[model samples]
Target: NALPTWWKQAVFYQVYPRSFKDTNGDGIGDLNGIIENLDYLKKLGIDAIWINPHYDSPNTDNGYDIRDYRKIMKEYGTMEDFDRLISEMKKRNMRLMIDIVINHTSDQHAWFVQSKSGKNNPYRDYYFWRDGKDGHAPNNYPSFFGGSAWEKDDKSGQYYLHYFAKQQPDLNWDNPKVRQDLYDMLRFWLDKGVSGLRFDTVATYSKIPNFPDLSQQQLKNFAEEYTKGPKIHDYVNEMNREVLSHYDIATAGAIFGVPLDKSIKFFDRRRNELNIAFTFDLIRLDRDADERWRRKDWTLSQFRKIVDKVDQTAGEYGWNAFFLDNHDNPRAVSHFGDDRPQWREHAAKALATLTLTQRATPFIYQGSELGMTNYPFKKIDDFDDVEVKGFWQDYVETGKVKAEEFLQNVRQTSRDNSRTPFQWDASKNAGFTSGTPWLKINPNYKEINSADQINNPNSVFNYYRKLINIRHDIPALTYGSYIDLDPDNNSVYAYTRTLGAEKYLVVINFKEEVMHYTLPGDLSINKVITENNSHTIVNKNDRQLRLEPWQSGIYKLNP
Candidate 1:
C-alpha cells in the first residue's frame, strides 16, 4: 500500500573482516578480498554489509579497541583499498554499514595515553578515574572478562574502570567534550558512503551515579550498570539530534535482553534513539548466571518464550532486529539447530525460515548462508576469543573445574565458533589464506565448504538465496503484524503475519516429529510457498497441516 524504508526491507549480513576472506595470502582477510566477493553478496540478495571494525587498533580486543577511528588497520588493508571497497559496493547498489565501537577505546589510544600521562591533562576526564579506597581498588566490581573491573595505576595513584578488559577502558559519556568527539567521529563515516552503523555494547554507555557497591544480584553482574541508565535516554537523543537524524542511515543499537518499556524508548520511530535495537532475550535462552555464569542447554519451549515476548512488544508498536547468532555468540546452527552431518542442513534451513518470516528485519552473520556448523574444540588452547580465554583461567586453572568439563562448555558457547575463517573450499586452510590463519580453521571445512554448496540446487546456500527471495517480494513480512498462534505449543512453533488484507501462516517443527496442527477456521490456504523439506506439507483435502521432522514452511492464507 505504501513505499517501505530500505532498512525495514534490508537483509544485513555481518562480515567479520579478519575471517571473511584473504586475498593477499597475508594470513588475514582484507578489504580487497571483500571487493572480490561483492558479486557473491549481490547474488545472495544482501542489501547492505555490516562490517565489523576495520579501524586502526592494537587488536587486543580484535579491532574493537580502536586507536584511531579515522585510520584503517594495516593488516586489513590501506585506506585506498577501503575507499575502493566503498566505491565498488556503491556501484552495485549495495550499501555499506560498519560497527562504530566508541563505547571504549584502547589503552594504547593517544587520548588514553594523554589521559594516563598526568592528572592535569584535559584527556584525563575522558575516562572514569577515581581515587582508590581503603588502600585497595575502587568499589569491587569484577571486570566483564574476569577479575577486578578496576585497574590500579600505581604511578598515577588512581583506578580506571573497564567492563570488558583492562586494556579496553570505558569512555566517560558524562563528558560533553567526549560526546562531541564521538559525534564528530560518527560524521566521519556519514560523510563517507556508509549508510548504517551497529553500535557496540550500546547498553553499557551510562553508569549509575556514584558507582555503588554490590547488592547480591547486582554484585553478580559486573556489567549490569550499563543498561537503562538515567542519562542513557539523554545521551542517545543528543547523539540522534546532533548527527543521526540529519543523515538517512539506519542505527541499530545492541541492547541485549531489552525490556518492552526500554525497547520502545529507543526504537520508537519518534524517539530517534535508534532505527532498531537487538534484544538478546532470544539468544540467551540457554545462558546461565554462574560461578562464571556458564553451563546450560535450552529447549524449544524456552526459545518460544522469547519469540512471544518480542511479538508482544514489537509486533504492534516499535521495531525489532531479529538474529540467532553473531560474532559474540556460537554459530546458530550449532547452538539452536541440529549440527549432525545429516541434520545440519535441514536445521539451518529451518532456522532461516523462522528468522525471515518473523516480521522483523533480519541479520545474517558471515557463513550463515553456507549453513556453517561449530568447530569441535578439544582443548582450551583451541579457543581464540578474549572472554573465552579469560574464563579458562577463572574456571579451569583454579582446580575447581575439570579440563574436559570446561572444554564441553567451550564447545557449546565459545565466540570462536563464529570467528573461524569462512570455508571457501576444501583446500589447505579452507582457502582462507596461503599463510597460516590468525585463528584455526574448522577442520570440517573439507566437507561443508562454500565451493561445494555454491552450485548445488539443494544446498543450504541456495535455500538461503531462495529465502531472501521470498522475503523481498512479500510486503506482509516487511510491514506486517506478527502473531504467535500457539505460544504454549511445545513441538511446533507456528505463527502468522498480517498486513491489511494480506496474511501469512508460517509453521516450524523444531525437532523430528509427525506433528499435526489444526488450521484456523477463518482461513484457508491460498498458496503453499517456501518449504524446506522433501515431504509434502498441508494436505489439500484435510483441515489440518502435517509437518515432517524439522520441516519449515510458509503459506499464504486467504482472507
Candidate 2:
C-alpha cells in the first residue's frame, strides 16, 4: 500500500517550546510563545509541527514525566492557551502534532499516586511493582539514567520499576485496564483535532514479564531486559486495531533499541502500523559502549552506509522522518559538520541542503534555520541536562576520565548544546526575553541572530527557507526515489533523485578544500537550481563539476 500523501509530502518542524521563544519575560517559552511564533513557521513553508510534551509535571525530564496528561502545564499555559496555539497553527495551514509519553508517568501522577497507596488498590497494577526477592530489591538492572532501575517504597517495603528516572515510573501495559486507559487518552487528543501524534519510547511499552538481570557484558547498555519485550506488538497492533485505524491522521513513533529490520515491522504502512518512524540507526553512530553520550569518530563511509540503509529500507517497507539534530543532541553543524567560524554557514547549509532534499518528510529544529551552533560550555555549571550531570558523577567520579577531559566531552556532545535559546536579534538576551533567561544564550548571537538573516537574501536563514521552498515546489524531491552516486567517495556526499523521466543530482563537499566531480555520462546539468557557496557550482558544459569547500549544489540533470 502507498503511504499517506499528507505525511509523505510533509515537512515537519520540531518545537522545543521552552527554548523556542520567551514572550512574557518569564525567561521560559510557553504555549503563548508558540502562538507568537506561528507566523514565522508559516512564513518558513512547513506543512506541520511536532511539539514535545507540555503536560503538567514537576519539570523533571523536561515535562516527559506527565502528572496530568489532560492538562497543560501552568508554566506552558492553561488548556485555553494550548487550544489557541493549535487553532492559530491550523489557521495558517500547518497542522499540529502532539507528543505522547505513553511509556511512563510522573510519580506525582494521580494514577501513580493512587497505585502507590497500597498493593490491593485498583490502580496498583497500573505500574510495575513487586515484593522484594529475599530482602533484596527486584533486579540489578540500572536505570536508563543511572543507578538501579528499581526504587524501594518505604511504606510497603516493596520495589517499583522506573526505566529512566525514579520520578518516571514505567506503565504496566500488561494490564488490560492500563491499555484501555492509554487508548482513551490517545483518542482525547485526536478528538482535539491534532493532525498526528508522536509516540515517545513506544518500543519500551511491553517490558518482559519476569525481571531479568543484565549479564555482566550487558551492564553498560540501557537495561536491555525491558526493551521491546514479548508483548509490544500485541499492544501496538491492538492500539492500531482499536484507535489508530479509526483516525486519518499521521503517526510517527520513536522506535528506540530496534534495528532497521524490526523498525520496518512496526512502522511499515502496509502493516496498518505507523505512517512513519524515527529510528536511532544513524544517531548512535558516534557512540560506543563506554559512554552513551560521549563523542566518537565518524567518517563519510560510515555515514553513507547508514543513510543508504534507511533510504533502502524505507523504500521497501516503511517511511522515515529525517532529522540530524534536536533538543536531545548537540547541534548537527557542530557534531557532524564543521562548526568553525569561517566554515560555519557553509557547513550548516550543506547539512540542511542534504537533509531537506532527502526522499522523506524533513524535520527542522528551532534556530537550525539560521545555522545555529553549540554553546561555549566552559565548566560543568554551564550544562543543565540530568543525563550529563548523571554521567559526570557515574563516570567522572570513578576516574574514568580526568575532570578537564570529561568537561571537554560534555562540551562537544552535551544535550545542552542544542538547548540554547533562540537568537532573535543583537539586543540584550539575544532579544529572546526581556528578563533573566532560564539558560544561557549562545554568545555568538550578536553576529548570528535571526534579525540579521530573516531579511538578508544571502543569509543562512534565507538559504534554509529557499531549501524548504524548493522541496515544497518539487515533488521529485519528496516522493522521488533516492539514487546514490559515487558511493565510495570519502570527502564528498553525492546522490541523485528520480521520479519517472525527472532526474536531479545533489552534490555536497564535506571537506574544507575544493574537489573535482564528474557528472554522469547520461546526465547533463541544465542549470544549477540552488547552491550555498558564492563560487560557481560547475566548470564543465555537461560533464564535470567543481565543489568548493562545504558547497552544496542541486542540479537539474538530463534537461
Candidate 3:
C-alpha cells in the first residue's frame, strides 16, 4: 500500500528552541544545541522536528514576533547554523519543519517600520492601517495582549491594527503583493531543503470585510469576525495554490475560531490547502471563564463530546492533528488530572493512551515524555510569559483581585508554568544550561528530570518511547478506523481502533476511584499491551473489566 509522501503517518516533535538547550551558555537555547541533540530525537522515534520560531525578533512575544523572516535570531544562532542543523537532522532521516509567522510582523520589521514612517511610503499598505474615525483609535477591537487592537501611529497619522501586542502589527493580506512576498519567503526556506512548515496563526491572515468593530451583543460573531474572518479560507487556498502545492512539503496550520466543518474542508487533501491543523477544542477545555481567576469546571463527557464531534467531522471529510499539550499550553498532567505524586504517571499514561488512539496524527511536545507537571510560582515576578504578567497587573491595579489570588491562578494556569526550562538532569540548571536559565527550572527536577527517567525501564519516558514506536510500527494503530466507546462514563475514557481484521481496544480510568466497565460483546481480548494490577476479569462472558485509580490498558482484540 502507498501513502502520501509528506505525512501519511508522520510523528512530529515540537522544540521550544529557547528552552530546549543552551550550547553558548548565554542563558538561552540555540541552533547548535539542537544540532547536538538530533540523535536523541531520532532515538525518540520522531519522523520530523517542528521547531518554534528561531527567527530574529525583539523577544517581546518570545519568538512569535518576526523582525526578519529570512534571518536567524542572533541569540539562537546564524543562518549558517540553521542550515547546519538541517543537514544534521537530514543525515538522521528526520525532516525539519520551521515555523512560519505570517499573520503579523514585528513592529521593527523593515516593512512595518517603513509603512509607519509615512502614508506615502511604498510599504504603507503592507500592514492593516486606517485613519482614526474620531479623536480616538478605531472600533475598540481588543488585542489578545490587552486593550485596543488599533494603535495610533503618530508619525503616519493613522492607526495600525494588531491582534496581539502593539509590537506585533497585523499584516495586510488584502494586498496581492503582500501574498507574493510571503510566498517568496516560503519558497526560500523550501529551497533551503526545509521539509515543511507549521503555519502560525494562519487563519488570521484574512480580515473581516470592512474591519467592522465587534458588536458586544453578538459574542460568537464578535470572536469570529475579528479572529477567524470569512476570507481566511480564500487567502489560505491562494497561498496553497501559489507556494505549498509547488513543493513536496507537509503543512500544518495553527488555527483557531474556525468551525470544525470548515476546518475539515481546509485540510482535505483534495483542497490542497493543508495536511493537518492543530485543533484547540481539547486544549481549551479548561478555559471555562473569560478570566483566569474564576474556577474551571470540565468533565470527561465534555471532552468526549468535543473529541467525538471533531472525530466524526474529520473522519467524514479529512484528517485532524490530535494533541493535548503544546508549548503554548499548560502541562496535561496538571490540566487534565490531579497531579498527585503517586497517580501522576498513571494519569499521564492514561491521557496518552486515550488521545493517541484517536483518529488523528498525534504530536508530542518536549518534556511531556517524563510526565512533567506545571511549576508552582511563589511570586508573580517569577513568571516569564508576557500575557500572564499583563493579566496579573490588570487584576491587581483594578483592585478586582488580590495579589495572592492572582498568584494562585498563575500557579495553576499560566503558560509560564509550561515554559520553564526543561529538566534534563539533577545538575545545575537541570542540564539545560551552565549559565542562569531564562526562566527558573521546576524544583522537582531533582527527582523527575530526563536523566533519571531515560534509564528507568518503567519510566514515563520509556512508556512514551514504546507508545510512539507502536504507533509507527503497528498499522492497526496508525491507519485504523476509530470508534468512541462509553461516552457517558465520566470517570473513564474508552475507545477502539480497527484496521481490517485487526482490532485494539483502549480503556482508561481517569478518576482516583476504581470502576468496572463492560467492553462491547462482539470483541474478545487477545493480548494486553499495558496493565496496572493483577486483578482478574469479573466476567469474561460479559466482557467485564475492572480498573484501579488512573489505570489503563491497551488490549489487542479478536472480533
- Summing lDDT over every window of 10 consecutive residues in candidate 3, give the lowest-scoring window: 533-542
What's the true lDDT of residue 316 in model 2? 64
Question: What TM-score against the true fold does each predicted structure earn?
Answer: 0.97, 0.97, 0.95
How far is 59's C-alpha from truth in model 2 (Å)? 0.9
* Candidate lDDT values, in order: 0.83, 0.84, 0.80
List pairs with backbone clashes in candidate 1: 143-149, 257-280, 290-293
lDDT value for candidate 1?
A: 0.83
Worst 10 residues of 2 by lDDT: 219-228
For 370-485, candidate 1 gives per-residue lDDT tens digits of 88988887877777778887787787888878888878777888788899999999999998899999898988898888899989989888999998999988888777877777
What's the ranking of the predictions by lDDT, best on top?
2, 1, 3
For candidate 3, what is the TM-score? 0.95
lDDT of candidate model 3 versus the reference: 0.80
